[PDB]
Design a protein around this ligand. Structure first.
Ligand SMILES: O=P(O)(O)O[C@H]1O[C@H](CO)[C@@H](O)[C@H](O)[C@H]1O
Ligand SMILES: [Zn+2]
Length: 455
């Protein structure tokens, strides 16, 4: 199997190129062997709505079965629903076959073994098992499990909206259309569906709510229908995007402000995690409400590990992965997060635009990406960590280099899904934004005067 599909957070490739039916089989063998090594024969398996789902999922399941595993096949579900299954069924292991928000031919695996989401050297360990033939053999079993109704009822019965709302829901032709519109209506909303038919060809916009262009249709519809809110899901339902009644995009770091207030109000002193791409305004806001802000590495699998380590009641990433432990299970879930948002908004007399505009804002860049190489991105970061001078500031190197200044902050880090450096900048004023950009531009050029600096 190609090494390149074994990534930091999970496995991902292109079907017909780096991911075939046979590699899905051996990945199933490897996961089953690792689960058994951790004492867990019981494994849930789910898939998203991609074209390659049926072909690859059968092989994944056979690989698990051929270890001696007891597989619970939950069929076509959102990623969080597979995570739910791995929390409520017999077994604490689960595999989701998904290509996330990527183009149609992409697929991959998100993997939980005996309660832990695998990352980094644990994903490499799977590849290594296959190479070594360090694989279990046995005669396992498959049971079909219809888990969606349980998940639906679990959420519906713990969410208590105080008034009706009208909501536009954009599923981007991904798998969130099997439940999100239905569940949101059942909470007590009217729902206007956009692209809620599951279609692995993704013929409209790609289901990636992190890009403003993929929210254009949602914003227009919210305005046309005088809706209270717009919601967008990514292809597998573990990420959410939000638009107010006036069309304002609420980026997930500011969504987390509302959620943090809510969670900490019932849980004094609670740890709240956010990734290094999130606004500095979160640190102060969480602290102000008496929570403990914990900044951590970008990447869903890494955030999930960190919530175990810290006992955090809530986590969020700038990409829109949001992780409730309070009243929930601790995994990222766009659908559940949407429900939690609707609950909070429904108890406020103000419209969603005014609820969010009350919170402090800074001037922010769009994400900046610089393409480098897969085999050099980490060395560039290492060189910056070794050599760079940032002036006076609070320097964090837990993921790349982030510097928090009195009036703003900047970040440079390596993506773990693409061969790029990722940068963000925010500040109180345009002048400070430019000062910080200049510091980062000059430190990049000091490492390699040939690096693009497209900011
Ligand atoms: O490419 P990156 O930045 O490493 O990772 C990106 O994809 C991951 C999977 O969606 C998310 O968890 C990160 O928040 C996102 O930034
Ligand atoms: Zn996703």
């Amino acid at each position: 199997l190609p090494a390149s599909i074994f990534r930091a957070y999970d496995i991902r490739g292109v079907v017909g190129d780096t991911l075939t039916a046979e590699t899905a089989y051996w990945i199933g063998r490897a996961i089953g062997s690792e689960s058994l090594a951790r004492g867990e024969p019981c494994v849930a398996v789910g898939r998203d709505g991609r074209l390659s789902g049926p072909e690859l999922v059968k092989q994944l399941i056979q690989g698990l079965v051929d270890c001696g595993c007891q597989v619970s096949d939950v069929g076509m579900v959102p990623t969080p629903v597979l995570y739910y299954a791995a929390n409520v069924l017999e077994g604490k292991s689960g595999v989701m076959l998904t290509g996330s928000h990527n183009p149609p031919d992409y697929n991959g695996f998100k993997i939980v073994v005996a309660g832990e989401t695998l990352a980094n050297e644990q994903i490499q360990a799977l590849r290594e098992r296959i190479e070594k033939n360090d694989l279990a053999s046995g005669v396992g079993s498959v049971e079909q499990v219809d888990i969606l109704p349980r998940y639906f009822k679990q959420i519906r019965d713990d969410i208590a909206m105080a008034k009706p709302m009208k909501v536009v829901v954009d599923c981007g032709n991904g798998v969130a259309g099997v439940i999100a519109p239905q569940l949101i209506e059942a909470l007590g909303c009217s729902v206007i569906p956009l692209y809620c038919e599951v279609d692995g060809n993704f013929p409209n916009h790609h289901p990636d709510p992190g890009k403003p262009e993929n929210l254009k249709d949602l914003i227009a519809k919210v305005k046309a229908e005088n809706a209270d809110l717009g919601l967008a899901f990514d292809g597998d339902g573990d990420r959410v995007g939000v638009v107010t009644n006036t069309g304002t995009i609420i980026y997930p770091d500011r969504l987390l402000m509302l959620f943090a207030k809510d969670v900490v109000s019932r849980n004094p002193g609670a740890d709240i995690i956010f990734d290094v791409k999130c606004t500095r305004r979160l640190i102060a806001l969480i602290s102000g409400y008496g929570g403990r802000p914990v900044m951590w590495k970008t990447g869903h699998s890494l955030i999930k590990k960190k919530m175990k380590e810290t006992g955090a009641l809530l986590a969020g990433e700038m990409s829109g992965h949001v992780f409730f432990k309070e009243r929930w299970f601790g995994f990222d879930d766009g659908i559940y997060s949407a429900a939690r948002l609707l609950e909070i908004l429904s108890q406020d007399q103000r419209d969603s635009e005014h609820v969010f505009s009350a919170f402090p804002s800074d001037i922010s860049t769009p994400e900046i990406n610089i393409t480098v190489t897969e085999d050099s991105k980490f060395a560039i970061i290492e060189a910056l960590q070794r050599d760079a001078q940032w002036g006076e500031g609070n320097i964090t190197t837990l993921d790349g280099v982030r510097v928090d200044y009195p009036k703003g902050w900047g970040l440079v880090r390596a993506s773990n899904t693409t061969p790029v450096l990722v940068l963000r900048f925010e500040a109180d004023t345009e002048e400070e934004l430019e000062r910080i950009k200049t510091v980062f531009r000059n430190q990049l050029k000091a490492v390699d005067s040939s690096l693009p600096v497209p900011f």
